[PDB]
């Protein structure tokens, strides 16, 4: 259809590369944007909408902001057209969408992040752990999911405690689950690192929230950290831009046969496919989503902070089971 391949980013991605009885077939609209202000977003969106009723809308973001997703969701709700976040904050996962919204995101969700975490701890039989969390949003749901997944396995987990001098004193576990922000991660960890919970056998585990932007490791992050983040190394934009049309060309064709009518926007800024993408697969690759719009086979990866002070992949998640490249944990000294 009239797919608008929107790119809001400072990275050098050319538009000629994008250029390189059917009702719509395929049409490509290329636009490169640098500013990410509300005024610029709304102006560009309305300019595209007035331009011959473009159907598909795929967006990529180079910044690391959280309101880009909110603005995209608002625009999607007010224009009734699906939007896909591919990079940066656009590809970042938000908490709760709206039923009227048609914003479909990428990247794994927080709960799905815990499952791959607990699949690794079992693989190295660290059957005793502890939970340390802070008042940052998203701790309440992480607590509830942690307990539930433990009680329904054959391992028999031995969770110690969930967590200010007394709080740090009663810690005696070997593996510690941590959940806080980067500006607070270097603070809580520094307090414990001086107290004697770092060294040979004391393994900290953090989600993608605590360890976000790569190549920004602070001066105090004990080498040997384990975290899970989306794979951005080998899955380039080509595998992340062709996937946008793969979902839509199938959903539109499947919608046309069931309903002899193709959806469209309002063609004006002034005054369906909502539940048709649950079952979809292109060339074997299961691109189907969930009830909340999350991915079903997210491309997560496991990273470790070696001595050279850089994040490197240690394990890969595929299908439903991780395939670690070591299977026997080596030793990393920190500081």
């Amino acid at each position, epitope marked *: *259809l*009239n797919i608008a391949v929107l790119l809001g980013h400072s990275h050098d991605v050319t538009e000629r590369e994008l250029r390189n*009885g*059917l*009702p*719509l*077939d395929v*049409n490509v*609209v*290329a*636009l490169l944007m640098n500013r990410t202000d509300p005024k610029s977003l709304i102006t560009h969106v309305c300019d595209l909408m*007035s*331009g*011959a*009723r473009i159907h598909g809308l795929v967006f990529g973001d180079d910044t690391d902001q959280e309101a880009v997703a909110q603005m995209l969701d608002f625009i999607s709700s007010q224009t009734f057209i699906p939007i896909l976040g591919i990079h940066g904050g656009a590809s970042m996962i938000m908490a709760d969408k709206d039923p009227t919204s048609t914003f479909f995101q990428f990247g794994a969700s927080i709960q799905q992040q815990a499952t791959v975490m607990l699949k690794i701890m079992q693989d190295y039989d660290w059957h005793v752990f502890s939970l340390v969390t802070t008042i940052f949003p998203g701790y309440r749901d992480f607590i509830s999911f942690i307990k539930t997944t433990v009680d329904n396995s054959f391992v028999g987990w031995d969770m110690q405690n969930v967590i200010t001098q007394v709080q740090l004193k009663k810690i005696h576990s070997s593996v510690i689950l941590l959940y806080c922000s980067k500006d607070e991660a270097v603070l809580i960890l520094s307090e414990a690192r001086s107290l004697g919970l770092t060294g040979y056998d004391f393994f900290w585990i953090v989600p993608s929230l605590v360890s976000g932007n790569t190549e920004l490791i602070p001066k105090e992050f004990p080498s040997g950290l384990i975290s899970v983040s989306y794979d951005d190394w080998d899955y380039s934009l080509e595998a992340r831009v062709r996937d946008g049309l793969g979902i839509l060309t199938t959903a539109a064709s499947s919608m046309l046969e069931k*309903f*002899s*009518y*193709i959806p*469209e926007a309002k*063609a004006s800024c002034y005054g369906t496919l909502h539940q048709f993408m649950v079952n979809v697969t292109w060339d074997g690759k299961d691109l189907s989503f969930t009830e909340e719009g999350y991915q079903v086979h997210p491309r997560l990866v496991v990273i470790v902070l070696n001595k050279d002070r850089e994040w490197e992949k240690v394990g890969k998640w595929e299908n439903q089971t991780l395939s670690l490249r070591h299977a026997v944990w080596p030793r990393y000294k920190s500081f």
Partner: antibody
Amino acid sequence: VQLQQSGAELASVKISCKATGYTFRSYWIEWLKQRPGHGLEWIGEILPGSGRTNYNEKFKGKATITADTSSNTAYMQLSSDSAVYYCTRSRGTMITREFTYWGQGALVTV
Amino acid sequence: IVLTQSPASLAVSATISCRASEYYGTTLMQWYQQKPGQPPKLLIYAASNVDSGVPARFSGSGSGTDFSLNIHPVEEDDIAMYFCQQSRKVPSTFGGGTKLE
């Protein structure tokens, strides 16, 4: 794809536009006025599949466009102007929004 | 969008001009040929691409707000009125007409 329309007229009137060359529930239908002495105008469009309708501000409140999914016909009603009329359909490749298939033409006069 | 073309009448034994008052590298202008008593026929789309099934004697060029149309060689066929249509904004509008003789 071929188009057919009603006959001449001579109050209110209604003009039919029947489709017999494609799937009538997929493409929009646009109405044009071509009163002699100038090029042309633009009235509105209608999608038979869902029934969404848009009208021109100049002709708003005077022309009502309706469609019947069973007989594959298009009805445009002018109420309470002598010009030649056309009903047309785009090629479907979109973006260009050009007019390729043309009707016969109904000559109304007062 | 308001269009204006000159001359209103042309005397040949030719070229046409249509000046406007682009969409990401695409020009939105179409030329229609209308013999007397017949519906219009599309001739050129995207201001540079001709329509299949038409004689090759027709060719066009233009960009921005100034576009022009020329024909060679001259034959009996180009004896009708012509106009230019815009599609950058809704609703569309046409030209003022141009005879030939």
